[PDB]
Amino acid sequence: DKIRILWVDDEIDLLKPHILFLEKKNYEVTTSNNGLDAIALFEEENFDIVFLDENMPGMSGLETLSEMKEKKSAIPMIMITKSEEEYIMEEAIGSKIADYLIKPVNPNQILLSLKKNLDDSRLITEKTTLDYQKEFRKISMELAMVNSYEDWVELYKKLLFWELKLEDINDQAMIEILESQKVEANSQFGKYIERNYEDWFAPKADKPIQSHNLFKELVVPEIKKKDKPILFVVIDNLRYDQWKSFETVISNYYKLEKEVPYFSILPTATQYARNAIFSGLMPLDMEKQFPQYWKNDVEDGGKNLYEAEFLSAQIKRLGLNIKEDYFKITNYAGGKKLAENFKALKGNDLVTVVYNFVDMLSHAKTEMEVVKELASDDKAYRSLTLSWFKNSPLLEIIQQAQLLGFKLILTTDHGTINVKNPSKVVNLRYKTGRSLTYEQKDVYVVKEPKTIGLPAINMSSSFIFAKNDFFLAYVNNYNHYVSYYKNTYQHGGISLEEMIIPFLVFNPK
Amino acid sequence: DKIRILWVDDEIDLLKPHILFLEKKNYEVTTSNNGLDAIALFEEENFDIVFLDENMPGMSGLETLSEMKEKKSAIPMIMITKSEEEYIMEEAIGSKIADYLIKPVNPNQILLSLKKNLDDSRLITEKTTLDYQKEFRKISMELAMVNSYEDWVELYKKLLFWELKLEDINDQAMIEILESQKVEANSQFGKYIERNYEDWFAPKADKPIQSHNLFKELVVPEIKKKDKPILFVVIDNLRYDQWKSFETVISNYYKLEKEVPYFSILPTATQYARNAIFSGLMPLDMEKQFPQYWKNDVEDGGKNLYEAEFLSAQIKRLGLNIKEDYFKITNYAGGKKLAENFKALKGNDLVTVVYNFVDMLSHAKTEMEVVKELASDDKAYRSLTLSWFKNSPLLEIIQQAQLLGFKLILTTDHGTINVKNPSKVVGLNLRYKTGRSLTYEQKDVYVVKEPKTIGLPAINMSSSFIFAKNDFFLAYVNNYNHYVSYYKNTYQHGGISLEEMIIPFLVFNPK
Ligand SMILES: [Br-]
Ligand SMILES: [Br-]
Ligand SMILES: [Br-]
Ligand SMILES: [Br-]
Ligand SMILES: [Br-]
Ligand SMILES: [Br-]
Ligand SMILES: [Br-]
Ligand SMILES: [Br-]
Ligand SMILES: [Br-]
Ligand SMILES: [Br-]
Ligand SMILES: [Br-]
Ligand SMILES: [Br-]
Ligand SMILES: [Br-]
Ligand SMILES: [Br-]
Ligand SMILES: [Br-]
Ligand SMILES: [Br-]
Ligand SMILES: [Br-]
Ligand SMILES: [Br-]
Ligand SMILES: [Br-]
Ligand SMILES: [Br-]
Ligand SMILES: [Br-]
Ligand SMILES: [Br-]
Ligand SMILES: [Br-]
Ligand SMILES: [Ca+2]
Ligand SMILES: [Ca+2]
Ligand SMILES: [Ca+2]
Ligand SMILES: [Ca+2]
Ligand SMILES: [Ca+2]
Ligand SMILES: [Ca+2]
């Protein structure tokens, strides 16, 4: 079927050369010399695109466009006109024109416009697929040369870039090559963490910023500027690719000043990593210095009940002079309440908000059929996250902060990974106990938890952390475990997805 | 701050007129005569936009664009070139060029391109705001004059048009004016239905197409064309504005041929409206002719178990000779199974698929908190619907149908409305009730004490139906305050509103 063009111009007779040109290229052109007759044709037929002149004796192009868009708002409209006035450009852009071509127009300019507005999705698919075909071997060589935490950050950024570009391609071979590069990257990263993690605790060790350093190394310098009040947001369980998915939404309100990828401590779980952010201490030092607040895995109830108390203690230890408030948002109603009353906080130096909803979406993928239909794969997960963020009380809180001239600091405690591969053992990405059987190739084994700043019941206590996209399955119910936990979002172990996470500073626009 | 343009061309000397033109207009132009140096400038400085020539002795425009997009993918890239190289327009479009201007270029064509790529958001917001300021009074006058079901369809289309444009706007005053017009429209529509609905059942009545007419009046003509096999999709509970939210997604696969608004029967609920689609009979006639299949509200278990049987019987009654199959998808796994095995249906004349949306009314507090975070208001609801459609097995089924050359028919049984105002009932979270001893606020509901007159069943002559008007929800007196706090701002159906009742029927040809 030929592409059907409706061309409205009072001088459509003088445009015969253009018409013959497009008919040679397999376009069907229907001509009209006035807006009113063009509207009648547009109502009766299903054109693929309309060309409009601006200056016509009866209805103008923009008047014709208004009527046509009201009737069928999905059909692309191009203005083709002698008018060079900026006010007409702005009126046409503001009316959602697809393109605006100034006469005299090269017939190939029109052809470009037809291809760009009707065939761009297929052309982007074809071009992206061939770009990755020509790039993927270079990405395998770059992966092979990684030999520092900074190279790991750079390589992760490269994989995220290609993951987002390839998400809608059709070529399964190329899709599986990207999936094989992600598996190899996580396998190498797993080995890197296993070999370096304990050494990173040595005096004057060369190490990335981690959970227990985050507040002192990256938040306090922004506080000491005393330039604007700071809204410090921890979005629980946010992956780097989720941050990338709503980067352009945020930029409507906030201009990115600084981006520091940083490393979650082990295990990559709220009770350890998120408490470490707020305390500025490793879990073992939280147990030693704050026994009234620190809870081990075995103890009852909430594991992050005391973040305000950890934070106030850390602020005092650092000798800061600030007015500071902490909020934990656990549902829509709480978020909406804080958004509507945020102005109360205008005289704070620091407002800290923990927002738990993504964590809720991440285990809702397995448990609620609603979220399961909405988040079947990583593309669907980022899509649902973006829809969430754009319509969330959290973005209303951020817009309120913007109007009050707050600096925005946005971060997370850890990410999550879509687990594929069972690993037998006697949380599905770390386990702690005094008797444990495991596949040693699959896990990072820590026989002496105190050497990596974790608590131990006794000298027999071990930690086990899953690597790659492994999930720790009990032998007891192995087949049912595999069937239930396959393709779910888990955290606690080692992967780029769980461990390398954004720290972002923005100025209000 | 001036807009910062990076212009990469090996003959930036020949472009001086363009640069002076743009500098007069408050643009700051930084020139570079080769890709390598341009990349270094792009890394060090913060450009708003980049202009690239394709044909250069070193790195090409497209090679330069690849390096720059990798570093800062948000910055628009415009190609300004003359080339004789084959397929360069296609290669540049596929590389996500923002625009492609063929030399020699009118300097005003470049200026257009700058405004379109950097100012379009702000200009659409300003124009939408000013146009609605000029339009809203006209919409109030039109609402005042509505006096036919056809006028109601036209007014609804106008409100939908403006609702979609205004959703991303700053001006609270204009947002509240639109919200007040929607409230008034539903109030008047409620009175209109209350006055006219019973007359629509008279012999030879003037009435819109309804649930029980849909298959015979709108689907059979497409079947009798005997042109292509038909995929007939009923999306459960779909609003007009939800169809609008994914219209441009489905156009990648299917070209819209015909769009007919039609009217759900009362109640606007699956058990009545959706069974009527498949049976071609009103619920009362389903009870009379198919007592083995029809279930009343009082009976246990599924209310839509027999749609395949109702449809096969209707097809036989109409004397159609077709190979036809029915599928009801109630979860991800079912949808994925049908998408992955759709080619098995290649020899069918008709494939009917019921595709359930997400449950908007969970009895579990934790699940309702998730739905409210994702769909607190109409904009959030359309956003979630678009994310759903783009990532659903339903779109995979539609793409499979397209590759087999199926015609697509897309419709729904009824919409849903965001409920705001409690209305007490005595004697299910839907906007209708049926009972023999109902207490209700009569001002809030359309009351039908003779259900058989509107093709509904009655247990006995004490049986009544009540249908909520406006944005009312029917609240139980038992635990009233907790009920109100839970169901406030939820998407419900069963009653009278433009959202529940006036719904799309769409016919598409495969691309
Ligand atoms: Br029309
Ligand atoms: Br004129
Ligand atoms: Br005219
Ligand atoms: Br021309
Ligand atoms: Br590799
Ligand atoms: Br591994
Ligand atoms: Br550090
Ligand atoms: Br907690
Ligand atoms: Br301070
Ligand atoms: Br609050
Ligand atoms: Br809010
Ligand atoms: Br070069
Ligand atoms: Br890109
Ligand atoms: Br030129
Ligand atoms: Br007027
Ligand atoms: Br009004
Ligand atoms: Br009819
Ligand atoms: Br059912
Ligand atoms: Br037939
Ligand atoms: Br809530
Ligand atoms: Br009766
Ligand atoms: Br009654
Ligand atoms: Br009650
Ligand atoms: Ca003219
Ligand atoms: Ca967490
Ligand atoms: Ca050149
Ligand atoms: Ca080329
Ligand atoms: Ca329904
Ligand atoms: Ca009665």
Numbering used by the authors:
A (entry chain A): 2 to 427, 435 to 517
B (entry chain B): 2 to 428, 434 to 517
What's the paper's own text on this?
Here, we report on the structural determination of PorX, a noncanonical RR that comprises a classic REC domain and an additional enzymatic effector domain that exhibits phosphodiesterase activity. Each PorXFJ monomer adopts a two-lobed fold containing an N-terminal receiver (REC) domain (residues 1–120), followed by a three-helix bundle (THB) domain (residues 121–209) and a C-terminal APS domain (residues 210–517).
The primitive orthorhombic crystal form gave rise to a single dimeric assembly (two monomers in the asymmetric unit), while the primitive monoclinic crystal form gave rise to two identical dimeric assemblies (four monomers in the asymmetric unit). In the primitive orthorhombic crystal form, residues 358–369 adopt a helical conformation in one monomer while presenting an extended coil conformation and an additional helical turn at the N terminal of helix α16 in the second monomer. In particular, only the helical conformation of residues 358–369 can support the proper coordination of the Zn1 by the conserved Asp360 and His364 residues, whereas in the extended coil conformation, these residues are facing away from the APS catalytic site.
